[PDB]
Design an enzyme around this catalytic site. Sequence first.
Site, PDB file in Angstrom:
ATOM      1  N   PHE A  18      76.321  63.203  46.294  1.00 33.37           N
ATOM      2  CA  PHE A  18      76.128  62.497  47.566  1.00 33.37           C
ATOM      3  C   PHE A  18      75.623  63.386  48.707  1.00 33.37           C
ATOM      4  O   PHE A  18      74.656  63.031  49.390  1.00 33.37           O
ATOM      5  CB  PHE A  18      77.420  61.761  47.972  1.00 33.37           C
ATOM      6  CG  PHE A  18      78.711  62.524  47.760  1.00 33.37           C
ATOM      7  CD1 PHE A  18      79.377  62.472  46.541  1.00 33.37           C
ATOM      8  CD2 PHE A  18      79.286  63.254  48.795  1.00 33.37           C
ATOM      9  CE1 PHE A  18      80.571  63.176  46.346  1.00 33.37           C
ATOM     10  CE2 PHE A  18      80.480  63.955  48.600  1.00 33.37           C
ATOM     11  CZ  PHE A  18      81.118  63.904  47.379  1.00 33.37           C
ATOM     12  N   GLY A  19      76.275  64.533  48.880  1.00 33.16           N
ATOM     13  CA  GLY A  19      75.963  65.509  49.915  1.00 33.16           C
ATOM     14  C   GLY A  19      77.202  66.275  50.314  1.00 33.16           C
ATOM     15  O   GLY A  19      77.442  67.370  49.798  1.00 33.16           O
ATOM     16  N   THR A  20      78.010  65.691  51.221  1.00 32.24           N
ATOM     17  CA  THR A  20      79.248  66.298  51.713  1.00 32.24           C
ATOM     18  C   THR A  20      80.232  65.268  52.306  1.00 32.24           C
ATOM     19  O   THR A  20      79.829  64.176  52.714  1.00 32.24           O
ATOM     20  CB  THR A  20      78.938  67.456  52.702  1.00 32.24           C
ATOM     21  OG1 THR A  20      80.097  68.269  52.856  1.00 32.24           O
ATOM     22  CG2 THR A  20      78.439  66.977  54.070  1.00 32.24           C
ATOM     23  N   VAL A  21      81.521  65.640  52.346  1.00 26.56           N
ATOM     24  CA  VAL A  21      82.603  64.873  52.960  1.00 26.56           C
ATOM     25  C   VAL A  21      83.180  65.792  54.027  1.00 26.56           C
ATOM     26  O   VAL A  21      83.597  66.905  53.711  1.00 26.56           O
ATOM     27  CB  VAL A  21      83.686  64.377  51.952  1.00 26.56           C
ATOM     28  CG1 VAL A  21      84.923  63.838  52.677  1.00 26.56           C
ATOM     29  CG2 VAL A  21      83.118  63.313  51.025  1.00 26.56           C
ATOM     30  N   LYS A  65      81.517  60.627  54.901  1.00 22.44           N
ATOM     31  CA  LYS A  65      80.582  60.943  53.831  1.00 22.44           C
ATOM     32  C   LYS A  65      79.212  61.046  54.492  1.00 22.44           C
ATOM     33  O   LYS A  65      78.767  60.092  55.143  1.00 22.44           O
ATOM     34  CB  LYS A  65      80.623  59.886  52.718  1.00 22.44           C
ATOM     35  CG  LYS A  65      79.637  60.115  51.581  1.00 22.44           C
ATOM     36  CD  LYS A  65      79.935  59.173  50.439  1.00 22.44           C
ATOM     37  CE  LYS A  65      78.714  58.819  49.631  1.00 22.44           C
ATOM     38  NZ  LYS A  65      79.086  58.254  48.308  1.00 22.44           N
ATOM     39  N   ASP A 121      83.813  53.333  38.501  1.00 21.24           N
ATOM     40  CA  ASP A 121      84.014  54.797  38.596  1.00 21.24           C
ATOM     41  C   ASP A 121      85.507  55.147  38.795  1.00 21.24           C
ATOM     42  O   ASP A 121      85.862  55.996  39.602  1.00 21.24           O
ATOM     43  CB  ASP A 121      83.126  55.424  39.695  1.00 21.24           C
ATOM     44  CG  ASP A 121      82.872  56.891  39.441  1.00 21.24           C
ATOM     45  OD1 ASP A 121      83.204  57.362  38.338  1.00 21.24           O
ATOM     46  OD2 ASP A 121      82.364  57.572  40.356  1.00 21.24           O
TER      47      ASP A 121
END
Length: 268
Positions: free
Chosen positions: A20-23, A40, A125
């Site tokens: 996704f990228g980052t939290v 997120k 998921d």
Amino acid sequence: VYLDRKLLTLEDKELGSGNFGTVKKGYYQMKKVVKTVAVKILKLKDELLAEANVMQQLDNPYIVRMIGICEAESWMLVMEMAELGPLNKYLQQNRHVKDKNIIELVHQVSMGMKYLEESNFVHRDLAARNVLLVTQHYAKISDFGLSKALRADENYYKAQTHKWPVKWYAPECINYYKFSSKSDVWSFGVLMWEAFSYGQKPYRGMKGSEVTAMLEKGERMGCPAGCPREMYDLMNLCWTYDVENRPGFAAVELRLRNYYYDVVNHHH
Ligand SMILES: Cc1nnc(-c2nc(C)n3ccc(Nc4nccc(-c5cc(CN(C)C)n(C)n5)n4)cc23)o1
């Protein structure tokens, strides 16, 4: 739905990272109070919007609440914070959590999945890494990126083209690309195994194809150390090969509910 970037303060240190990228942890100025949030950050946009569209429809204590969405330097999904983080990482770090507390936490997940099944949403998921702890006695289901609202005329979602977390996927997911609440029941069985194994990874040292080959021979993962017989029997029942004979979340939740109160009153 759309939040004011001026009301959002993001921390420099990132909580987690992945596909996704980052939290990142943040703070959102609410009606009178300030609310700690998990954000997120994208840094793909259609997948974030659809994920937000799913979360906007869900209303349950055992599901992570979306505060809203925000378009700044990157697209952002703002959620309510679950301070203790992922269930798998928590249990790896806290190996002395009692068996009664693990039952309690997996029961919470089943109550949230009972709701998801009633709302006719497939999670797709469901894993211990996607369960977040508010407290040591309060679990919530997160990660709605692969989640689907079932069509009014279908009990399943058909995926057009197969990365997939195959170790958590039911045989009908692998063989027919069919995702239903009953395949979420299969993933929940793997989730139960992970929780009772204190965040250990399932099918240790095995390839996706070796897992499929093992399940095809009727072989299932063994009972984790200290896991009660009744809980291991439930895991096995979630691992019924035939979708029709596999129990639904209302039957899984009832099994867990009754067992938890049996353990609770026994402790007294
Ligand atoms: C990897 C990884 N992802 N999250 C962590 C992580 N590690 C620690 C120590 N945390 C502590 C609190 C927390 N809170 C929290 N609250 C509300 C929502 C979220 C959350 C996280 C994800 C990403 N998924 C892949 C899990 N989404 C979609 N939503 N996260 C997360 C976290 O590690």
